[PDB]
Amino acid sequence: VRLTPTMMLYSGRSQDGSHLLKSGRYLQQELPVRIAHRIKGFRSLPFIIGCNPTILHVHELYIRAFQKLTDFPPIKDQADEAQYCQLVRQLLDDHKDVVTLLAEGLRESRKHIEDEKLVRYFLDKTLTSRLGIRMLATHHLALHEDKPDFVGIICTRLSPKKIIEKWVDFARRLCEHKYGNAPRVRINGHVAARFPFIPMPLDYILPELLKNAMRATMESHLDTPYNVPDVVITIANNDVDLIIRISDRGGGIAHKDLDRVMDYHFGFGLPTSRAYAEYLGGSLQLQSLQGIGTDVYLRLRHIDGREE
Amino acid sequence: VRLTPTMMLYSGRSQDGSHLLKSGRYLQQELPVRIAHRIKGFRSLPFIIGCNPTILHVHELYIRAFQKLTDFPPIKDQADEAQYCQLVRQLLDDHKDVVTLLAEGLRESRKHIEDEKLVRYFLDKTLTSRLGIRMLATHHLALHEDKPDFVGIICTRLSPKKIIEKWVDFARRLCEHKYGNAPRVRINGHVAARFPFIPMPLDYILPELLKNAMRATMESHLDTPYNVPDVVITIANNDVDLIIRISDRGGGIAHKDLDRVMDYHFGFGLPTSRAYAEYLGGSLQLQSLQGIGTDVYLRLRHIDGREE
Numbered sequence: 001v002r003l004t005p006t007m008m009l010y011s012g013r014s015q016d017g018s019h020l021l022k023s024g025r026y027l028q029q030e031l032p033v034r035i036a037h038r039i040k041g042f043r044s045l046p047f048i049i050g051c052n053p054t055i056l057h058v059h060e061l062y063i064r065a066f067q068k069l070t071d072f073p074p075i076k077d078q079a080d081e082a083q084y085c086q087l088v089r090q091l092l093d094d095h096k097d098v099v100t101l102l103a104e105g106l107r108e109s110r111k112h113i114e115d116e117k118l119v120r121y122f123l124d125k126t127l128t129s130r131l132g133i134r135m136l137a138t139h140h141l142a143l144h145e146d147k148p149d150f151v152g153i154i155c156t157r158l159s160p161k162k163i164i165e166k167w168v169d170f171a172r173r174l175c176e177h178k179y180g181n182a183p184r185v186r187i188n189g190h191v192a193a194r195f196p197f198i199p200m201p202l203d204y205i206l207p208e209l210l211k212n213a214m215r216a217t218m219e220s221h222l223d224t225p226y227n228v229p230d231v232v233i234t235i236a237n238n239d240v241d242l243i244i245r246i247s248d249r250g251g252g253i254a255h256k257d258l259d260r261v262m263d264y265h266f267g268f269g270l271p272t273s274r275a276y277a278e279y280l281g282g283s284l285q286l287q288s289l290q291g292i293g294t295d296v297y298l299r300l301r302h303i304d305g306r307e308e
Numbered sequence: 309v310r311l312t313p314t315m316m317l318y319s320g321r322s323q324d325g326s327h328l329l330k331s332g333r334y335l336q337q338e339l340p341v342r343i344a345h346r347i348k349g350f351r352s353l354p355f356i357i358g359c360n361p362t363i364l365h366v367h368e369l370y371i372r373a374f375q376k377l378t379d380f381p382p383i384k385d386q387a388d389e390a391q392y393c394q395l396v397r398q399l400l401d402d403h404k405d406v407v408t409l410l411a412e413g414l415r416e417s418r419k420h421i422e423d424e425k426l427v428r429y430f431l432d433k434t435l436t437s438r439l440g441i442r443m444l445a446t447h448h449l450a451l452h453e454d455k456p457d458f459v460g461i462i463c464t465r466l467s468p469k470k471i472i473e474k475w476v477d478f479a480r481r482l483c484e485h486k487y488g489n490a491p492r493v494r495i496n497g498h499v500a501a502r503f504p505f506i507p508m509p510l511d512y513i514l515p516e517l518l519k520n521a522m523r524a525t526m527e528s529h530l531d532t533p534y535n536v537p538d539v540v541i542t543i544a545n546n547d548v549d550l551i552i553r554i555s556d557r558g559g560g561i562a563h564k565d566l567d568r569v570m571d572y573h574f575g576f577g578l579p580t581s582r583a584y585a586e587y588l589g590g591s592l593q594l595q596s597l598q599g600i601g602t603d604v605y606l607r608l609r610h611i612d613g614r615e616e
């Protein structure tokens with residue numbers, strides 16, 4: 001029964017399978033409202049932008065999603081709950097390319113972009129609500145599985161080091177295939193911490209931050225790709241939050257670019273990651289040392305409490 | 309002929325000693341105006357606060373300083389210039405304890421402090437104007453000396469590493485005398501950079517930042533004072549600015565204190581340092597990793613240009 005931005009993830013008495021209906025009935029109430037808020041979002045978009053064929057397509061997806069959800073009858077038994085899970089799965093799949101479609105749509109509407117903020121905000125709101133929905137949906141679905149150390153999508157004993165390492169491997173491979181090598185990554189600080197945490201956010205953010213740190217490093221060592229500065233990550237775990245600092249020695253972010261780094265370039269990783277972090281009660285801050293490198297600070301608040 | 313916040317430091321053709329009069333006549337025009345602005349500052353202070361005997365004393369010092377400066381006749385020859393230097397030296401000495409007097413005065417007026425901002429701002433404005441005056445005064449006086457690599461207070465080839473080391477030594481001694489030991493300090497990055505720079509700001513800021521980093525380290529290793537984590541400093545020198553990052557592993561600044569750290573506690577080092585940095589076109593940012601340590605970023609803009 002953890003919490004987030006009005007979203008609530010349930011953890012309850014299985015056996016009877018009663019917990020699945022209390023969760024499903026909640027998911028059934030919540031999804032329509034969140035889908036509706038996004039539809040309003042598309043309705044308030046500047047006419048010229050909302051007219052773009054692609055944007056107009058994504059808008060129709062939200063409308064059709066709202067219809068299917070509103071058409072489903074109230075969950076009364078485990079029989080309905082099961083079918084409702086099928087609807088939800090169809091939706092997540094139907095909206096798998098929403099973000100790609102938006103980028104394409106907004107890119108084409110770049111010439112008409114008058115207000116710079118009312119686009120950064122539209123993408124923030126769209127990407128986050130989409131994360132909140134995926135977390136709510138995925139959690140309920142996960143309540144049907146029985147993985148060890150997981151109550152839905154909530155890991156009861158997550159290891160920041162473990163998850164960071166997973167993505168380090170992922171990121172290093174993409175890097176080697178692209179440059180012939182990749183920076184090793186050292187991890188210090190609270191390397192042995194373990195606590196209840198929802199990995200999903202970290203599953204998106206970390207690989208975005210790790211690819212950036214590794215790229216900057218390679219792009220600034222074109223003369224010695226076979227010998228580059230390590231990327232150093234530090235884990236700070238306290239009762240209020242989890243802090244992961246990712247430091248690279250890739251030259252830093254030039255003064256002339258310090259602004260456009262956090263904007264979308266249909267570069268989505270950094271702006272999306274900050275949105276995600278802020279949506280969850282955390283933050284994403286950059287410290288640039290021009291000529292040397294960059295320090296990125298990812299802060300995420302702990303699960304409805306304080307643990308280490 | 310370098311620049312700053314409307315302040316201008318002169319560098320010119322000696323020999324004739326003509327450069328000393330063009331500088332003196334400028335210093336003579338500038339000091340009264342800056343002293344006057346501060347007097348207005350004391351006049352706009354809330355009556356209850358400005359009534360404190362001590363605060364009232366400091367206020368009288370500014371008034372008497374303004375009088376002496378306004379009484380001095382226009383500099384016409386090297387003879388006047390020389391005497392004017394004597395006036396200036398008397399002033400800097402008469403106002404040597406201004407800050408200590410203010411703290412004492414404001415501390416006593418703590419009960420009456422209604423507005424929290426209009427005090428932080430009064431101390432900012434008082435401490436900075438005081439720095440700007442000391443830089444203007446000291447520079448002109450320094451134009452009489454003939455030190456190597458110095459045009460007044462402007463060092464023509466300052467070494468951040470060199471100046472940092474000087475203060476590391478200073479800070480380590482105070483630390484050992486207080487704890488029996490002190491963290492070693494490693495310095496990386498652009499350790500060989502050299503460029504025109506005014507050391508004064510760094511002469512105050514660095515020892516304040518270095519004492520904090522060393523203190524936090526000792527206070528969080530009371531069980532092993534003989535073996536503590538190094539303090540690590542990184543120098544980033546580019547064409548726009550000089551960045552000195554000071555990282556300690558002293559536990560960081562607790563969430564509950566993150567606000568009061570940048571306030572005055574009549575703790576003056578951090579708030580004064582940020583004021584100084586901002587006054588000079590730079591900044592002072594803190595990144596706290598609760599449970600691990602703190603990273604402090606000092607940024608100072610280069611002398612009327614771009615060098616490395």
Ligand SMILES: [Cl-]
Pocket residue numbers: 048051052053108109
């Ligand atoms: Cl269009």
Ligand SMILES: [Cl-]
Pocket residue numbers: 092130131133134
């Ligand atoms: Cl999704």
Ligand SMILES: [Cl-]
Pocket residue numbers: 174175178211215
């Ligand atoms: Cl890559």
Ligand SMILES: [Cl-]
Pocket residue numbers: 189190
């Ligand atoms: Cl530790």
Ligand SMILES: [Cl-]
Pocket residue numbers: 356359360361416417
């Ligand atoms: Cl009083």
Ligand SMILES: [Cl-]
Pocket residue numbers: 400438439441442
């Ligand atoms: Cl002074």
Ligand SMILES: [Cl-]
Pocket residue numbers: 482483486519523
């Ligand atoms: Cl000390």
Ligand SMILES: [Cl-]
Pocket residue numbers: 497498
């Ligand atoms: Cl280097």
